Amino acid sequence: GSAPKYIEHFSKFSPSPLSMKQFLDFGSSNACEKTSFTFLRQELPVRLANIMKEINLLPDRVLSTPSVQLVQSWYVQSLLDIMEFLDKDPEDHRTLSQFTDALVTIRNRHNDVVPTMAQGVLEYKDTYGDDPVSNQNIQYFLDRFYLSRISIRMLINQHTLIFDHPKHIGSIDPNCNVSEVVKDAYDMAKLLCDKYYMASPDLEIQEINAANSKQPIHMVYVPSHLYHMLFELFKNAMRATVESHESSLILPPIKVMVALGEEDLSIKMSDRGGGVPLRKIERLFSYMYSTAPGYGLPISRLYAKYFQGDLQLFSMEGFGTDAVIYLKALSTDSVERLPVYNK
Amino acid sequence: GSAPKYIEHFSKFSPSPLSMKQFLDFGSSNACEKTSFTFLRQELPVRLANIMKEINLLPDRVLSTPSVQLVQSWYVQSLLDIMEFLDKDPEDHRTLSQFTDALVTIRNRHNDVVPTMAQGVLEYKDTYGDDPVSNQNIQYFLDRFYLSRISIRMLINQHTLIFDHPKHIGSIDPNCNVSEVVKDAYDMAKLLCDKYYMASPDLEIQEINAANSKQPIHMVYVPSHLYHMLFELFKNAMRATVESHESSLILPPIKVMVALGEEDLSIKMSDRGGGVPLRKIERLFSYMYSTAPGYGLPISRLYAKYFQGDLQLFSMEGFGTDAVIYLKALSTDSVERLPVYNK
Numbered sequence: 001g002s003a004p005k006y007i008e009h010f011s012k013f014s015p016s017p018l019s020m021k022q023f024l025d026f027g028s029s030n031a032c033e034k035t036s037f038t039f040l041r042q043e044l045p046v047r048l049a050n051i052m053k054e055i056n057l058l059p060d061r062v063l064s065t066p067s068v069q070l071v072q073s074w075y076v077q078s079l080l081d082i083m084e085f086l087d088k089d090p091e092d093h094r095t096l097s098q099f100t101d102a103l104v105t106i107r108n109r110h111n112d113v114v115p116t117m118a119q120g121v122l123e124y125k126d127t128y129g130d131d132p133v134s135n136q137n138i139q140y141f142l143d144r145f146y147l148s149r150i151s152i153r154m155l156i157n158q159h160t161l162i163f164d165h166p167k168h169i170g171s172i173d174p175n176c177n178v179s180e181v182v183k184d185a186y187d188m189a190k191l192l193c194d195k196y197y198m199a200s201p202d203l204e205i206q207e208i209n210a211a212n213s214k215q216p217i218h219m220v221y222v223p224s225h226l227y228h229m230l231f232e233l234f235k236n237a238m239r240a241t242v243e244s245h246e247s248s249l250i251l252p253p254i255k256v257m258v259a260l261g262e263e264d265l266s267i268k269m270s271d272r273g274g275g276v277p278l279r280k281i282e283r284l285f286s287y288m289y290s291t292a293p294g295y296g297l298p299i300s301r302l303y304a305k306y307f308q309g310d311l312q313l314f315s316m317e318g319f320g321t322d323a324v325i326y327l328k329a330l331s332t333d334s335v336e337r338l339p340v341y342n343k
Numbered sequence: 344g345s346a347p348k349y350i351e352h353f354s355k356f357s358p359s360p361l362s363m364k365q366f367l368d369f370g371s372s373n374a375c376e377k378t379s380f381t382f383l384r385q386e387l388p389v390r391l392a393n394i395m396k397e398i399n400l401l402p403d404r405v406l407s408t409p410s411v412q413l414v415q416s417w418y419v420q421s422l423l424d425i426m427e428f429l430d431k432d433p434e435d436h437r438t439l440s441q442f443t444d445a446l447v448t449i450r451n452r453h454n455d456v457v458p459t460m461a462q463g464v465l466e467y468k469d470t471y472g473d474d475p476v477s478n479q480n481i482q483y484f485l486d487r488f489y490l491s492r493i494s495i496r497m498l499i500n501q502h503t504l505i506f507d508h509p510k511h512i513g514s515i516d517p518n519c520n521v522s523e524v525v526k527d528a529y530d531m532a533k534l535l536c537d538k539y540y541m542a543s544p545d546l547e548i549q550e551i552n553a554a555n556s557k558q559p560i561h562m563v564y565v566p567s568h569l570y571h572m573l574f575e576l577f578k579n580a581m582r583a584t585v586e587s588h589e590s591s592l593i594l595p596p597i598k599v600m601v602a603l604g605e606e607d608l609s610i611k612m613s614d615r616g617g618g619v620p621l622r623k624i625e626r627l628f629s630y631m632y633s634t635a636p637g638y639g640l641p642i643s644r645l646y647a648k649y650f651q652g653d654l655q656l657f658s659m660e661g662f663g664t665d666a667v668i669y670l671k672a673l674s675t676d677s678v679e680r681l682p683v684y685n686k
């Protein structure tokens with residue numbers, strides 16, 4: 001075959017990071033399925049090949065494991081699917097129709113990658129141990145691998161959702177009400193918490209719009225990404241709150257604050273679930289230390305970092321924990337954070 | 344001379360980190376000026392020579408600057424002062440008396456090192472620029488240099504204060520009431536804030552003793568170190584609170600929480616001084632970016648880290664900032680964090 005040839009060629013190109021404003025302007029009224037196809041048939045192989053070349057640089061002790069090999073075969077096949085559209089003509093409506101169906105097949109093919117890499121991490125711990133040098137190598141690779149996967153899925157979701165005057169531009173809401181997303185993630189976590197604990201804390205939301213005290217806080221963002229982060233944070237904050245008060249009757253509420261600054265949009269989730277010692281907080285974001293025979297926090301941070309944001313934890317052992325999602329307030333600052341294969 | 348010979352010899356030894364419990368047990372009833380002299384005349388040259396060898400490994404562009412040369416001459420002279428006590432006999436009371444006076448002279452000799460290195464950092468910015476590679480090199484060296492200096496001053500303070508049944512063991516309070524130190528640092532910052540702004544926010548303290556809800560929170564620590572950290576944090580929180588409310592009348596109070604867990608003793612200082620964007624928070628701990636023709640935060644964190652703690656900032660732009668001091672709750676976990684010269 002010629003899969004190594006394709007990887008070597010496109011890995012020389014660097015991925016082109018797109019801003020949130022670019023996604024919005026590309027997918028709005030000026031959206032053209034021809035233009036998106038011309039861009040994607042080149043950018044998708046570049047992003048695929050860059051992470052595929054990093055996978056090849058893994059030691060053969062990891063490269064020859066069944067988990068890495070299975071995932072690498074998914075990327076080879078996905079890369080080859082995109083290759084067949086290079087010589088195709090964008091002026092043919094059947095060419096664009098087959099390209100969209102090919103993206104859906106690729107998206108569903110990689111749908112079960114989180115438990116697969118979780119199996120791979122557990123295999124590495126039981127084969128070579130959990131030394132701190134191995135954790136940093138696993139953390140470094142998995143962060144870049146998953147962030148690369150988020151960026152590829154973002155491109156595919158924007159194309160397939162738009163080419164199928166709505167208010168949503170694919171997966172992007174140009175008027176995303178942050179408090180409403182907080183409530184949705186809270187309600188879902190409350191339903192799970194009531195079914196398993198027969199008790200759940202209440203929600204308190206406070207907004208701080210520094211520039212316009214009266215106006216509700218809106219932003220341009222991907223609501224599903226923000227939901228994912230808040231949902232994982234709500235589940236942890238409820239689990240800790242209920243378990244740390246089993247012998248008590250009062251159940252402290254979960255307090256969420258949404259602050260809109262001139263540059264940052266910050267979401268703080270405060271719980272009183274007993275807190276966690278600092279020594280163990282720094283391990284909650286580690287794939288290796290969060291794997292048992294549990295990736296909500298590490299992946300949630302990658303979603304935050306994907307558009308130049310962050311997700312941070314600071315706890316008070318014996319009381320509770322604060323979780324803060326940092327997002328860019330302006331669409332011009334919300335640029336893709338992409339891993340690039342360098343030397 | 345033979346200053347390079349001494350440096351090369353003692354730099355092969357590694358510094359011996361002492362725990363807070365060791366300091367307490369060494370300096371209490373079983374304290375012996377003979378034993379402390381025997382240990383210090385060996386450990387002080389080892390710690391001096393280790394940082395002096397790292398200074399020699401700096402590039403000549405920095406090593407030949409007047410600031411580094413002036414400081415290096417202080418350490419050479421301080422090292423030579425300790426050398427004269429190697430052949431001396433510990434059984435002579437005049438030998439121990441001259442050793443204590445020599446430590447006082449060394450402590451006062453290095454008393455003006457913070458503005459000197461501040462001048463050196465400004466000289467580097469104006470000579471070679473403020474590139475991110477230079478910041479990481481300056482940050483890496485200054486952190487280790489200052490932490491080394493804190494550890495040397497700690498040893499000297501313990502010897503000179505004890506050998507001159509008190510409740511304080513040198514600079515260590517085995518029953519340090521944390522809230523009382525918070526109040527002292529607050530009162531000092533309030534006096535400065537009223538003199539310059541004619542207004543100051545109020546203080547609110549809440550204690551959370553998880554194991555003993557009724558008992559006030561005590562710990563074994565160095566009160567002057569904790570005061571220094573809280574004083575710098577109070578000055579920043581008051582400056583931001585007053586300035587961000589000049590056009591307003593209500594002045595939000597500064598809320599401090601002291602949590603005692605099974606492993607951590609955490610002190611959170613919450614202000615509503617408008618907050619800082621995340622992009623600039625990460626630069627507040629940088630010596631290079633905090634130098635203008637301002638080291639309260641970087642040095643305060645080193646004091647926290649000195650006994651296996653930390654100091655962290657997380658702000659909400661448009662609202663306020665939380666500052667958290669993490670300390671070890673147990674004296675057995677409060678071990679010196681010392682930089683060691685490796686390859």
Ligand SMILES: COC(=O)c1cccc2c1-c1ccccc1[C@]2(O)C(F)(F)F
Binds near residue numbers: 022027032035040
């Ligand atoms: C006028 O510009 C475009 O139409 C366009 C141009 C380049 C890339 C894309 C578009 C587009 C439009 C709708 C959905 C997805 C996309 C993209 O594939 C991307 F933004 F996701 F990269």
Ligand SMILES: COC(=O)c1cccc2c1-c1ccccc1[C@]2(O)C(F)(F)F
Binds near residue numbers: 365380
């Ligand atoms: C019985 O142990 C000792 O007396 C002792 C032994 C080794 C080192 C020290 C002491 C001691 C005592 C009082 C003040 C300072 C010190 C030390 O120089 C150190 F702890 F600061 F290192």
